[PDB]
Amino acid sequence: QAAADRRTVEKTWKLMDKVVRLCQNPKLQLKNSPPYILDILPDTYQHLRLILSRYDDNQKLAQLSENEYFKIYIDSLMKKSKRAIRLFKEGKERMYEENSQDRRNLTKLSLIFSHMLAEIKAIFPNGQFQGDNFRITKADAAEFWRKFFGDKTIVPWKVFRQCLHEVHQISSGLEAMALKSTIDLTCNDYISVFEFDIFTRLFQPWGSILRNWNFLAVTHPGYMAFLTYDEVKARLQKYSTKPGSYIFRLSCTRLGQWAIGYVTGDGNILQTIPHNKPLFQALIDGSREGFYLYPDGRSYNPDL
Template identity: 50%
Template sequence: MVDKKCVDFCYKYLDKVVRLCQQPKLNLKASPPYILDTIPDIYEKLQGITAKYEENYDILSEIDYFQIYILTLIEKCKQTINLFKNSKEKIFDIDSDARFRLVKLSLVYSHLLNDLEALFPQNTFVPSFRITKPNAAHWWVTNFGDSVIVSWQLFKNSLIQTFRIDSDTQLLALQTTIDITCNNYVSIFEFDVFT
């Protein structure tokens, strides 16, 4: 269960990431996915969702997807903060590994925003998200029922039972391609993007 205190921690972490990324010396390019646009958008979306559920917060806090989302977001914020802390001046070098990792995290935040918007249109949880391709939708429902998010392990096991996977390398490549939020879970939205 994700209580209001946990969501408040999430806001604090998001604020910290924005402050770190606003350093003029960082000289971020304002091209998509632009972390200084994405983080405030996530913040605003979360505020809209929590406001919508203010009278029934228990319902929101019991949604598995929301629990995993908040914990993932906090983890990605911690990862970003540690990147700044551990890389020190290297983060300001646009050709450094640290900068490459920051760009990758920007992409993850963008995917997190899109995922949240897909499953909470108008700030209300919609567990009936529709997968675009009928065969893919059938495969998801057959394997996961009405779940909107499953662990990578469960997803992988279902994948192996249905399709021929030749190697661990191929599995890792699939995970990298499908788990675009890099949290060891696959949401129905991520699966739809993949298919």
């Protein structure tokens, strides 16, 4: 990666501006709903400008431009922006078909940008690098990170996987790639300490984390990945005559937290945020109470 000096950061700004203009095409009919690329990219520009304002002399800019996380961040922001641009150039009119694979790929990129914004705000809070001081929520997960990586803010996927393998083995390439897509929110082949904190919060406890991840995010019909509150209500409408139908999902606005949606006996659709217990225990309890019976409306309800 190149040094993340001012010129390189400004080059990234110009690419992000082109993505914004591409996404303002009136034929796109883009809905103001998270992740909303037309808010995320300006917000990213604003936070990057804040960072530069905190590193406002030659020696400070030197430190910033050679910070390993920041160099990787800017390189990855530039690559995803070029990808977005290329998507429009190759998609042509297919970009305006709402359910085309091209538009689906735009939605994927909008999610990636949303995650990248959350990451940079977590690592440079108020524009100052704090990655070496980042506090991992789960103490046992924190001990793994510190043992193998110390105060590092970011690690290549290959290195991360090799260390994780020492604690939880992974033999399947399919499993490894699925795990990478869960952990590596920014899809840049690096695991940040922020991405590690989100993963270990969601799939706690740490001692069984691969089992928990498999049970919830791999082999569970109820798992819907990232959805908005409105999208949960809309998807569960078709199950409104099957009380006990339920799904669980992630919020791109509040990373690291699960939400559940279910159909009541009356046919109403309710949503709830489980607290102070791992999701799989909240599903166990909700099933034994008769609320969570049919994940995605299906008749097979996994048991843990």
